[PDB]
Structure 1
Amino acid sequence: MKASRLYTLVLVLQPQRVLLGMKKRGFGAGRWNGFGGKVQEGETIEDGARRELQEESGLTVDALHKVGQIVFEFVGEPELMDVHVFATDSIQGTPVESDEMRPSWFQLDQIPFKDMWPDDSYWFPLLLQKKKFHGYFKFQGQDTILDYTLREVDTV
């Protein structure tokens, strides 16, 4: 059985648009993602998701709501990524471009799936339907899924 490391992912989802962040630099440049990072010692997962959103994008929120949980496994990496997925419609402030990340809104008929993580094509449609989900994806590298499971759940 592998060990897992906790991560967060926040989708800034409004009725007609979603805010995503593009990686500007390095391995994975050009890919659009929600906002998040590693959970730190002593914080709740939800508080870590809020902190990461603020650190990564400049945005604050009053509340998040949990919408999913996805485990990622990469070939060659013994540690699983346990990603806790949150969404909010209610944001404070404007998103900020950093040296690492450029934020941009996309209309919900222009979701840039080809330039997102491949798994997003599977679970983001559930998020748009206000469904909750559990997922697992095994990757060879950044582009290829070798195995995956996705299931709608009533409780995350």
Structure 2
Amino acid sequence: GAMGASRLYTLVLVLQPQRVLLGMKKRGFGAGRWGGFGGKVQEGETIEDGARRELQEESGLTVDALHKVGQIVFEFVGEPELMDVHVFCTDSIQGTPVESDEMRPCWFQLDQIPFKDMWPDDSYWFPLLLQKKKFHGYFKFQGQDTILDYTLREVDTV
């Protein structure tokens, strides 16, 4: 039948030549994992404005200019609504990251990407992000650890 309805999310990676900024989620769904900064797009908000807003709210960083790098759809067994995540990256920042109620930030060298403490799907698409290759992906999860199905492709245009 019809593909499930999806909720629009953004996800932002601050990716510099030698390091990436990640936030450890302090509470809720996915708590205890390092990831990018993101959340739900609000009514009337452009996707990129939502991405900038999520970065500011969760990390304190203000950036003008994000680059679209990928789209990932997440599905969780037992929940009919999908997560439609638009992924962005920026290399140029001009402030300091701060701990927020949602996220605790640390910088990671790019030979120390903390995959063991990141969502399992990141092992597949994060390498494409690091190579500056655009991608579309889909991951079906049983709970937070187990992938039952996934698709992934490199694209020329997101």
| TM-score calculated relative to the size of structure 2 | 0.96
1:28-72 deviations in Å (ceiling 9; x for gaps): 332101000000011110111001100111001110000000000
Counterpart residue number, 1:4: 6
Q: Is there any run of 5+ residues in structure 1 with no aligned partner, and where?
A: none
> What is the distance in 1 between the residues matched to 2:151 and 2:41?
24
> The residue matched to 2:38 in structure 1 has which SS?
coil
Q: Is there any run of 5+ residues in structure 2 with no aligned partner, and where?
A: none
1:59-101 deviations in Å (ceiling 9; x for gaps): 0111000000000000001000000000000112100112331
> What is the distance in 1 between the residues matched to 2:6 and 2:154?
22
> What is the distance in 1 between the residues matched to 2:43 and 2:28?
27
> What is the distance in 2 between the residues matched to 1:45 and 1:99?
23
RMSD in angstroms over aligned alpha carbons? 0.9
1:109-149 deviations in Å (ceiling 9; x for gaps): 00000100110110010011110000000000001000000
| TM-score calculated relative to the size of structure 1 | 0.97
> What is the distance in 1 between the residues matched to 2:87 and 2:29?
23
What is the total number of aligned residue pairs between the two structures? 156
Counterpart residue number, 1:78: 80
Distance verdict in 2 for CA 1:57–1:120, change over 3 Å: same
> What is the distance in 2 between the residues matched to 1:5 and 1:74?
13
